[PDB]
Every structure is written in structure tokens, then in C-alpha cells.
Amino acid sequence: SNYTVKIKNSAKSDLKKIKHSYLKKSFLEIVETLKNDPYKITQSFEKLEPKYLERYSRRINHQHRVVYTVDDRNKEVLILSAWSHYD
Amino acid sequence: SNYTVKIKNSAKSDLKKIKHSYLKKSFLEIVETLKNDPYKITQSFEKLEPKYLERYSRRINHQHRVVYTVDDRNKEVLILSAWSHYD
Amino acid sequence: MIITSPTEARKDFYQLLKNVNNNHEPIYISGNNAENNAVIIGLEDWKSIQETIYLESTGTMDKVREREKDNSGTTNIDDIDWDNL
Amino acid sequence: MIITSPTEARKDFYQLLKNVNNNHEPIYISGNNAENNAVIIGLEDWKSIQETIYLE
Amino acid sequence: MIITSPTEARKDFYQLLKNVNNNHEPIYISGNNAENNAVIIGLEDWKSIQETIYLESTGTMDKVREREKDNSGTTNIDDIDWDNL
Amino acid sequence: MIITSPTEARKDFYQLLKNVNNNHEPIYISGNNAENNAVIIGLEDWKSIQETIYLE
Numbered sequence: 001s002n003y004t005v006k007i008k009n010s011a012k013s014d015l016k017k018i019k020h021s022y023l024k025k026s027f028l029e030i031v032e033t034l035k036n037d038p039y040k041i042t043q044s045f046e047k048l049e050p051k052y053l054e055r056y057s058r059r060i061n062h063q064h065r066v067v068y069t070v071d072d073r074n075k076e077v078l079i080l081s082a083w084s085h086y087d
Numbered sequence: 088s089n090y091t092v093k094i095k096n097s098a099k100s101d102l103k104k105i106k107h108s109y110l111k112k113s114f115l116e117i118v119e120t121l122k123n124d125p126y127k128i129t130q131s132f133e134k135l136e137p138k139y140l141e142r143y144s145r146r147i148n149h150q151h152r153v154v155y156t157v158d159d160r161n162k163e164v165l166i167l168s169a170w171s172h173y174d
Numbered sequence: 175m176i177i178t179s180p181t182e183a184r185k186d187f188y189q190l191l192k193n194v195n196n197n198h199e200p201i202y203i204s205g206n207n208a209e210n211n212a213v214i215i216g217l218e219d220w221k222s223i224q225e226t227i228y229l230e231s232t233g234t235m236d237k238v239r240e241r242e243k244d245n246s247g248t249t250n251i252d253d254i255d256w257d258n259l
Numbered sequence: 260m261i262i263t264s265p266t267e268a269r270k271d272f273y274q275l276l277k278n279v280n281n282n283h284e285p286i287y288i289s290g291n292n293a294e295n296n297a298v299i300i301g302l303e304d305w306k307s308i309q310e311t312i313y314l315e
Numbered sequence: 316m317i318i319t320s321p322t323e324a325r326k327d328f329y330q331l332l333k334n335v336n337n338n339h340e341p342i343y344i345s346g347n348n349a350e351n352n353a354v355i356i357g358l359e360d361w362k363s364i365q366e367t368i369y370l371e372s373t374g375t376m377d378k379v380r381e382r383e384k385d386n387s388g389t390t391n392i393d394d395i396d397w398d399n400l
Numbered sequence: 401m402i403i404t405s406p407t408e409a410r411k412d413f414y415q416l417l418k419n420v421n422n423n424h425e426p427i428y429i430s431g432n433n434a435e436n437n438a439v440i441i442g443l444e445d446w447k448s449i450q451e452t453i454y455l456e
Contacts (some may be wrong), residue, residue, distance in 0.1 A: 001137050006389040008382045016400045021307075025399060026283075031392050040230055044284045046378075049367040049453045055379070057366060060284040062304045063311065065370065067379050078389060080382050086233035086374040096246035099254070106259045113424075118251050119237065131423040136226040136312045142226055142238070146424040149445040150372055150452075154238050165248065167241050171234045174375050180276060187269040192294040202302070203276065210276040211302035220285070220298045223308060225430050230311050231373045260362055262430040262437065264405060289403035289430060296403070321417060328410040332429060332438045343443070344417065352443035360429070361439040364449060371452050390403045 003070070005034045007079040014083035018060070026060045027082060033058070034077045038070050055080075090157075091119045094166040101170035105147070113147045114169060120145070121164045125157050142167075177202045182208070190214060262265050262287045275299060321346040324355075331355060406431045409440070416440060 007015075018027050032041055038056065048055040048067070056067040060082070067081040105114050108144070120127055130145040135154070144152040147169070154168040176199065183190055183203050190201055195216035203212045215223070229235045261275075261284065268275060268288045275286050280301035288297045300308075316330045317340065324331060331342050336357035344353045356364070370376045402419065409416060409429050416427050421442035429438045441449075 002329055003336075005392040007392055007395070008387055009390050010382045010385050010387040011378075012390065012395065012400075015395060015397070019397055019400055023307075042281060044282045044366075046363050046366045048370065051363070057370065060283075061283050061307050063227060063307065065375070067370065067375065069383075079392065080379045081375050081381070084280070084370060084373050084375045085231045092251040094251055094254070095241050095244075095246040096249055097241045097244050099249065102254060102256075103259045106256060111256065129422060131425045133222050133225040135229070136222055138222070144229065148424050148448055150368070150448065152225075152234070154229065154234065154431075167238045167253070168234055171229060171232050172372060173233050184269060184272040187272070188265060188295075191288065191290075191297050192266055194297050194419075195294050203299075204302075205276075207274060208302075210273075210280055212276050212279055212301050213302055213305040215298050215300065217287070217289075217298060217401060219291075220300075223312070227285035227308055227311055228369075229374075231369075233374070251281075260358060260428070262428065264433070287428075289405060321414065324412060325413045328413065329406060332406055332431070332436050335438055336423055336436050339454055341446075345443070346417075349444075351414065354441050354443055354446040356439050356441065357416050358430075358437035359435075361426070361441075364415050364453070367453055368449055 001036065002013055002075070003035055003038060004074075004076040005031055005079065006076060007082070011079060014081060017083045017085075017087070018064070020066075023060050023064060027066065030058045030066045034066075034068065034079075038068070038077050046065065088123055090122050090125060090162045090164050090165045092118055092166065094169070097164075098166060098168055101168060104153075104170045104172075110147050110151065114153065115155045117145045117147060121155065121166075125155070125164050175202055176200075177204050179203070180205045183214070194219075260284070260287065262289055264288070265290045268299070280304075316343060317341070318343045318345050320344070336360075373377045401425065402427045403430055405429070405440075406436070421445075 018024055030043055033086045042061055044059040046057050048057055055069055057067050059065055066079055068079045070077050095146055105111055117130055120130060133144045135142040135144055141153060143158055144154050146152055151171045153166055155166045157164050178201060178221045180203055194201055194214055198219055263286060265288055279286055279299050283304050286299040321344055335342055335355050339357060339360055342355040406429050420427050420440050424442060424445050427440040
């Protein structure tokens with residue numbers, strides 16, 4: 001019902017691109033869903049392949065995704081990417 | 088109905104990746120279409136945006152495109168990319 | 175730009191679909207709650223848009239724009255030595 | 260991927276408008292001919308797409 | 316792995332669409348030519364695949380796999396100061 | 401981007417198989433029962449997709 005949402009520090013450069021592209025509002029709406037139910041079928045939530053690795057994605061918009069995994073044991077969401085354009 | 092098909096020299100390295108990914112035959116079918124009619128409605132032919140720049144694409148496979156322009160006066164097709172991945 | 179309300183768009187919806195495809199121009203749908211504003215685009219025009227954004231997001235268009243401006247010259251495709259590659 | 264007919268899109272229209280903006284996924288409208296085929300995309304997603312296509 | 320000919324796929328087509336969604340198991344169509352070789356997949360199963368291919372083609376999954384492996388630690392998302400960005 | 405019904409897909413079955421392999425784009429099948437929807441994709445494209453996902 002509640003999760004800790006963290007981000008790999010090597011992924012924080014994505015957040016600056018999210019900010020400069022005026023997508024911070026859409027990104028933290030995803031963060032709020034990740035805090036409550038990271039499996040809620042909203043924001044085009046998808047289970048990435050191969051599904052045994054249990055990586056997930058949510059759409060910040062049509063181009064960019066939040067890619068993350070979930071530690072169901074300790075109830076913690078690890079954001080691994082918040083920018084889906086090759087830079 | 089012939090067109091001349093040229094590739095930018097800086098795009099030659101794309102062809103190396105085409106060859107070693109077994110995409111050569113598909114790429115050469117696109118070339119043969121470009122020689123006859125680079126506007127033929129096959130191979131998922133698309134007019135790229137912004138359309139005033141008059142760039143086009145055809146699909147080598149699900150992932151990779153031939154991106155090109157067309158000199159209609161001289162009947163010359165210029166391939167600018169044949170590999171849609173960063174490496 | 176063509177702008178209509180959600181109410182008016184819903185009534186004349188079949189004509190809207192016909193118009194986006196005939197005129198190749200999007201219709202904008204603007205209501206009181208700007209949260210639910212949207213755009214309607216003909217499917218064929220959408221595919222060119224989708225193809226472009228895909229090639230942008232892969233870095234292909236950035237590479238294509240550089241290659242247009244470099245002085246590398248061209249080579250006739252029939253001159254490519256495929257065995258050497 | 261949400262695919263609907265023109266008639267069902269007409270009926271569920273107001274819900275489609277908010278789903279499109281919430282899910283950031285376009286609704287595909289497909290019918291029996293080309294005059295009936297379109298997509299619905301959120302205005303803000305569409306503006307971001309317009310930015311990606313018209314760079315400096 | 317279900318392999319069937321184009322003729323038998325066409326005959327049982329309506330049931331194949333049901334089985335591909337119920338079993339979540341793709342159906343391989345293999346005929347005498349390459350142009351008639353194809354795969355039928357349920358739409359929701361396809362969307363997971365489609366989304367993954369997009370993230371792979373943009374290089375995002377490479378950076379995801381890199382960052383999973385590195386030793387950079389994790390900052391809590393509420394601790395991020397967007398003004399120091 | 402062909403979006404067709406299961407009935408029309410069965411009717412044009414052989415041309416659709418050719419189209420998916422020549423265009424390297426999937427054909428989407430959307431019926432009145434939205435959860436029996438499906439996708440047809442060329443075999444070679446499918447194999448390249450699978451190896452991209454499952455490569456060690």
C-alpha cells in the first residue's frame with residue numbers, strides 16, 4: 001500500500017533532461033503511483049521482456065518512459081531510467 | 088524509369104552492420120525499388136516529418152530503416168542512413 | 175487551426191474523421207477542463223509522425239542531419255564492395 | 260493498445276479523452292474504410308511530439 | 316511450439332485468435348514460401364514485446380542494464396532537489 | 401498500418417501474410433470482442449525481435 005521510491009544516482013542525469021523538457025510534472029505523477037501501487041494498470045504500465053527479470057515501464061509521455069524494478073520484499077521501487085531518447 | 092542510387096560515404100559504416108546482421112538481401116530489395124520508383128507504396132514507405140524537407144524511409148526490417156532523399160530533376164536517390172541503432 | 179469542443183466533436187464525429195483524412199490536418203478538441211484536451215489525426219498522417227519520432231528517439235535523425243552537412247561525398251550503391259565489409 | 264470503431268469511440272468519447280491524457284497512449288479509431296481511420300492523442304503529448312519534429 | 320500451415324491457419328483462424336490470447340502462446344505459420352511465414356500473438360502480449368523493443372532500439376535498456384550493475388548508490392526520490400539540477 | 405477485423409483478416413489472409421513480410425510492420429486484428437485481439441508479424445522480424453530480447 002506504500003513503497004519507498006529511489007533512483008540510481010547514475011540515472012539522475014535523466015532528471016535534468018526531464019526538467020529542461022518540461023516533463024517534471026508528468027514524471028512525479030508516476031512517482032506518486034509508484035509510492036502507492038507500482039503495479040496499477042495506469043500510465044501504460046507494462047511488464048518488460050524478458051518478464052522473468054521483472055522490469056517495468058510507465059509513460060511520462062509518448063516518447064519517454066520511467067523504467068524501474070520493484071523489491072517486493074522490502075517494498076522499494078528502484079527507478080533505473082527516466083529518459084528514453086538516445087543521448 | 089531508372090533512378091541512380093548513391094549513399095553518403097559517412098553512411099557506408101551502416102552497410103557493414105547490415106551485412107553482419109544478415110540484412111543485406113532486404114537492403115538490396117529496397118535499393119532495387121529505389122532504382123525503379125523511390126515513391127512506390129511498398130516496404131512501409133513513409134514521408135518523414137517535417138514533410139517540406141522531403142525525407143523518406145523504408146523498412147529493412149522491424150527495427151532498421153533506409154532514410155533517403157530524392158533529386159527528382161536528376162533522378163538520383165541519396166541514402167543518408169541504413170542503420171537505425173546507435174551502434 | 176481547427177478547434178472544436180468535445181460536445182460538438184462528439185456529435186459530428188463521423189464527419190470529423192472524414193475531414194482529418196481528406197484535408198490532412200488535425201482537429202483540436204478543447205473543453206473547459208484543459209486536462210482532457212486532445213487532437214484527432216488521420217491514421218496515415220499519424221504513421222508518418224510515428225515513424226519520424228521513432229527515428230528521432232533512436233538518434234537516427236540526429237545522425238542523418240549531420241551526414242547531410244558533412245563533406246564526405248557519395249558513392250554509387252552498385253560500387254559497394256560487400257565482400258570487403 | 261486501445262482500438263475502437265468510430266461508433267464506439269463516439270459513444271465512449273468523453274472517457275477516451277481523459278484516458279488518452281492519463282495513459283499517454285493514443286486511441287486508434289478503425290472502421291470499414293480509410294475515411295474512418297484516425298487516432299486521438301492528448302494535446303500535451305501532441306505538443307511534445309511537435310517539438311521533437313520542429314527542432315532548432 | 317505450435318507450427319501450422321497457412322491453409323490450416325486460415326481454416327481455424329477464429330479459434331487461433333482465441334487460443335493465442337487464452338494460452339498466451341504464439342502460433343507459427345510456416346508455408347512453402349518465405350512471404351507466407353508469420354507469427355500470430357495476442358495483442359496484450361505483443362504490447363509488452365513492442366514496448367521492450369522500443370526501449371532496446373533507443374538504447375534505453377543498455378543504460379538500464381549498465382546502471383543496474385554500477386556502484387553509484389540510490390538517492391531517495393523525495394531527496395532530489397530539482398533546483399540543484 | 402493495417403487495422404482489420406478477424407473476418408476481413410481471414411478473407412485477405414494470404415495477402416496479409418505477404419504484406420507483413422514485405423512491409424516489416426505488424427497487422428493488427430481487432431474484433432467485437434476486444435480481448436481476442438491479435439497481431440500478425442513476419443517470421444524473420446519475429447526472430448530478430450526475440451533475439452534482441454533474449455541474447456546473452
